[model samples]
Target: IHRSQPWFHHKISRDEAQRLIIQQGLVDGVFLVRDSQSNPKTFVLSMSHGQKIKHFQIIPVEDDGEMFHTLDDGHTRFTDLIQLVEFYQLNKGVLPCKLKHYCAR
Candidate 1:
């Protein structure tokens, strides 16, 4: 069976994105993705950490052999945003904290 990912919020602004996580209790690991305000071709990873919401731009990279999404300057790559999110949940690859909760609307 396929599970639903309520965490993947589409087309939300940075304003509401942070507020949503804040409204969700401002925990250490709650997070979500929103379209980047500056770059339409990229995405933003908004997460709550150290009592604040931090945003990281996720950029797409073409690895010659295939295309992937990279958030840490190509240190780690994912086929999709969900793969990136799911991976970070288990390991704190680059973010301050591991993704433990998803702030879904």
Candidate 2:
């Protein structure tokens, strides 16, 4: 029932990642997000690995233990979104789409 994202799979593609750098904010025009705006302390990370744009939110819970970042609504876990980003940075995570060249842009 959705067609917004077609490039996404278990893993992200190369050119797709490139296109993302542009879509992350802008290609050759105005911008919305900037590198300076990110901090490990902050929650809610927005990223696109392959197809659809995804957001990693910081959920505060576990009053008795440390917290962590979650994806697909806690379907996945990461010490932090940054770690998650890095994990996928060079990982095949699926599909035949492996990003040969990853330019964060």
Candidate 3:
């Protein structure tokens, strides 16, 4: 888990997360990750882009007999959520924009 990440909010609500992102001024690519409310084993990547907030569901994948995290089903996999977000921070990957700012705690 990426509990040490500056943008990782541990276990906050979706609405509370939106408030946090909005508090940061909605610049494109500002994002945060939080525990999913509906799915105990899943996480949510909340981002600001194009003047709107969007959420990406990140679920654990059990393929290949190992555990991994992915945002786009099974297309891209990272051993940890930290690497997953880090990769998107630089590459954009399946997200609309590269992660630019983090909602620091």
Candidate 4:
């Protein structure tokens, strides 16, 4: 996991998040997951540099498997993932953000 802000100090914003995601040349897509209690929906998109690093989890694909998993422990439900992302955004400045580069098991 990589945790550090940009060398250039500046108040980050949601627009900045989108720009960052695109700058990093990462994947472009929407992140859809349920809330921790599985009662709500959370959605995010990767468009520019910074947003690219937001994808903190990966799910395996069997010939027909279709689902998402948390990177922290692979057991956290999709809803929890959304909660985590929301929490991160809320505390983006107060807490140091982390980026995890997953590896195949």
Candidate 1 residue lDDT tens string, 53-80: 9999999888778988889999999888
lDDT of 1: 0.83
Tens digit of per-residue lDDT, candidate 2, span 1-105: 111223222234434543665565432211111121244433433344444444434443332487655434554556744455444445534212223332343
Per-residue accuracy of model 4 over 1-105 as CA lDDT, tens digit each: 112322211233445544554444454232222112212332232221233434332332223465543444444433334454454444432222422221111
Highest TM-score scorer: 3
Number of backbone collisions per candidate: 0, 1, 0, 15
Q: How accurate is candidate 4 locally (lDDT)?
A: 0.33
Please give, for residues 33-97, the per-residue lDDT of candidate 3 as tens digits: 99888846789999999989999999888976899889999899989988898899999987899
Candidates 2 and 3 compared by lDDT, better number: 3
Model-by-model lDDT, in order?
A: 0.83, 0.38, 0.90, 0.33
Give the CA lDDT, 0 to 100, for residue 24 in model 4.
Answer: 45
How high is each candidate's TM-score?
A: 0.88, 0.35, 0.94, 0.24
Find the number of clashing residue pairs for candidate 1: 0
